[PDB]
Each structure stands twice: as structure tokens, then as C-alpha cells.
Amino acid sequence: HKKLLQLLTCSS
Amino acid sequence: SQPIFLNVLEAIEPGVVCAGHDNNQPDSFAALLSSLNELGERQLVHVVKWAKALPGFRNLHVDDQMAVIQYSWMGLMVFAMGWRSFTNVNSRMLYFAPDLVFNEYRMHKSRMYSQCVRMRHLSQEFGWLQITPQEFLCMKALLLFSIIPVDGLKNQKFFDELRMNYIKELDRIIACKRKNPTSCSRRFYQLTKLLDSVQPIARELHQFTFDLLIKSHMVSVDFPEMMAEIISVQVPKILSGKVKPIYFHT
Ligand SMILES: C[C@]12CCC(=O)C[C@@H]1CC[C@@H]1[C@@H]2CC[C@]2(C)[C@@H](O)CC[C@@H]12
Structure with a gap:
């Protein structure tokens, strides 16, 4: 969930 | 005049992804499945980046964005793999990755x-x-919007509109002759049938990977972090009937 959501939060 | 939607889909389509498979080791169940799992983890990064760049996708609630990616990745990846296999080896073998091509053995x-x-x-x-490549790209984009919870998403209305628009884009690009309206109708039928056919394949693979994760320590198969999380938290929602595909045909 961390790495997966991190791919959305980065440069949203 | 010159469109825009197709320009975007062509521009964001992921490039080559390698599995990192050591082709020196024998073709054992453990080695092959561990490499497929790593390929999944790698491709998941690209699926997220692709989806976030799709027209309208960022309009969805953030939790819905996560949800649709976590439910649809298997279908998306299988569909893309089918295309690679078709273009690279005329479907003779399964072209998972340049370093992970499956033969009969x-x-x-x-x-x-x-x-x-x-x-x-x-x-x-x-x-x-x-x-056609354009039909492939539009169909693949629509797969992202083809599986949701039975209870719906946080903003289901926005999802329903987005899906509608993606269906419209597919309808616009179908390879047919307008002078023969029957050809376009037959083509759209064929494409919606093809899209629906992805779902039972994805379901079989969801069942397989879930069962594999459960016994993974016993059979020496490694699952990376993102895969293990999604297969243990989201995949069971599919398997238990909480999350279902949206079929064109009954
Ligand atoms: C999505 C992947 C990996 C990406 C791809 O090209 C399609 C392929 C289909 C079978 C999947 C695999 C990822 C790992 C899985 C889920 C294994 O655990 C069992 C079935 C595998």
C-alpha cells in the first residue's frame, strides 16, 4: 500500500 | 480535424519491461513463477504511471484511482502481453518479457x-x-474501467461518465466502412466480445496467484511487496464476489 500509493502521491 | 485522444494514448503507452529472469537456471516452477511475480511488480509501476496520465483519470477520487488499478492490473497486463505475443512471435509463444518468453516446456x-x-x-x-493498434490502445484503456466493487466507488457518477467517454472513443476508432453500417455494428460486437473474454482469463489467474501466495513459502516462490499486498487484500475481494467485472454482454 505504501509503494503503490507513493506512485500516486508523487507529482499528483 | 486532427484528434487528441489517440495522440495521448499512443504517447503514454508503456515501453519494454524486462522480468530480470536468469535464463541460465533450469525452468523450475519456483524460478519461473518468481520471475513472473517480479515482472508483475515492475509492470505495476508502469501501469500506475500510465493510468495517471490518461485523459480524465485524475478526476476520479484518489481512493477510486487506487482501487481501479488494484482490481484491473491483471486484465490490463494479460491483454498487453497478448498483443506483444501477437506482434513479436505471431502468438506462437507467450511474450511476457524479452527475457521471459514461454515455450511449451x-x-x-x-x-x-x-x-x-x-x-x-x-x-x-x-x-x-x-x-488495429488504435483499437488495441482504446480497448486496453477501457479495461481499466471494467471492474468495480458491487457496492460502487466513492464517486461512482464520475466513474460512469469516464467509462462512457472511453466507450465513445472506442466506437469512434473501430476499423469499419461507414458506407456499410452493418460492418461497423459487426466490428463493435466483435470488439466488445473480445474485451469481455479477457475477464474469465483474468479470473483464472487471480485464483491461481491467490492460491500460490498462500503456499508460497512451501513451494519457494517469492512475491514482491506490492504484489503480495494486492493479492492478499484486493484479489480476495474479487474471489469472494465483492468486486466484479463490468461485462458488455450478459
Ligand atoms: C501479470 C503477469 C505479469 C505481466 C504479464 O506480462 C502478464 C502476466 C500474466 C500472469 C501473471 C503475471 C504476474 C504474476 C502472476 C500473477 C503469478 O503469481 C501467477 C500468474 C502471473
């Missing part, structure tokens, strides 16, 4: 030969139907 050793046969048939459909 690997299909057997993977213990998912039956599922591989179904994936090869999917790949062959791209040839039988003479699917």
Missing part, C-alpha cells in the same frame, strides 16, 4: 499450462480479428 513447468493456452488464444484473436 515453460507452460508445463509453470503449472499453469491451461491458463497459458487461454492466453495464447486471446493473443491469436488479435490476428483473427485483425485488430
Whole structure:
């Protein structure tokens, strides 16, 4: 969930 | 005049992804499945980046964005793999990655030969139907919007509009003759049938990977972090009937 959501939060 | 939607889909389509498979080791179940799992983890990064760049996708609630990606990745990845297999090896083998191409021996050793046969048939459909690259891209985009919770999303209304628009884009790009309206109708029918056919394949693979994760320590198969999380938290929602595909046909 961390790495997966991190791919959305980065440069949203 | 000159469009825009197709320009975007062409521009964001992911490039080559390698599995990192050591082709020196024998074709054992453990080695092959561990490499497929790593390929999944790697491709998931690209699926997220692709989806976030799709027209309208960022309009969805953030939790819905996460949800649709976590439910649809298997279908998306299988569909893309079918296309690679069609274009690279005329569907003779399964082109998972340049360093992970499955021949008959690997299909057997993977213990998912039956599922591989179904994936090869999917790949062959791209040839039988003479699917165009633009049809492929629009169909693939629509797969992202083809599986949701029975209870719905946080903002289901926005999702329903987005899906509608993606269906409209597919309808616009179908390879047919307008002078023969029957041809366009037949084509759209064929494409919606092809899209629906991805779902039972994805379901079989969801069942397989779930069962594999449960016994993974016993059979020495490694699952990376993102895969293990999604297969243990989201995949069971599908398997238990909480999350279902949206079919065109009944
Ligand atoms: C999505 C992947 C990996 C990406 C791809 O090209 C399609 C392929 C289909 C079978 C999946 C695999 C990822 C790992 C899985 C889920 C294994 O655990 C069992 C079935 C595998």
C-alpha cells in the first residue's frame, strides 16, 4: 500500500 | 480535424519491461513463477504511471484511482502481453518479457499450462480479428474501467461518465466502412466480445496467484511487496464476489 500509493502521491 | 485522444494514448503507452529472469537456471516452477511475480511488480509501476496520465483519470477520487488499478492490473497486463505475443512471435509463444518468453516446456513447468493456452488464444484473436493498434490502445484503456466493487466507488457518477467517454472513443476508432453500417455494428460486437473474454482469463489467474501466495513459502516462490499486498487484500475481494467485472454482454 505504501509503494503503490507513493506512485500516486508523487507529482499528483 | 486532427484528434487528441489517440495522440495521448499512443504517447503514454508503456515501453519494454524486462522480468530480470536468469535464463541460465533450469525452468523450475519456483524460478519461473518468481520471475513472473517480479515482472508483475515492475509492470505495476508502469501501469500506475500510465493510468495517471490518461485523459480524465485524475478526476476520479484518489481512493477510486487506487482501487481501479488494484482490481484491473491483471486484465490490463494479460491483454498487453497478448498483443506483444501477437506482434513479436505471431502468438506462437507467450511474450511476457524479452527475457521471459514461454515455450511449451515453460507452460508445463509453470503449472499453469491451461491458463497459458487461454492466453495464447486471446493473443491469436488479435490476428483473427485483425485488430488495429488504435483499437488495441482504446480497448486496453477501457479495461481499466471494467471492474468495480458491487457496492460502487466513492464517486461512482464520475466513474460512469469516464467509462462512457472511453466507450465513445472506442466506437469512434473501430476499423469499419461507414458506407456499410452493418460492418461497423459487426466490428463493435466483435470488439466488445473480445474485451469481455479477457475477464474469465483474468479470473483464472487471480485464483491461481491467490492460491500460490498462500503456499508460497512451501513451494519457494517469492512475491514482491506490492504484489503480495494486492493479492492478499484486493484479489480476495474479487474471489469472494465483492468486486466484479463490468461485462458488455450478459
Ligand atoms: C501479470 C503477469 C505479469 C505481466 C504479464 O506480462 C502478464 C502476466 C500474466 C500472469 C501473471 C503475471 C504476474 C504474476 C502472476 C500473477 C503469478 O503469481 C501467477 C500468474 C502471473
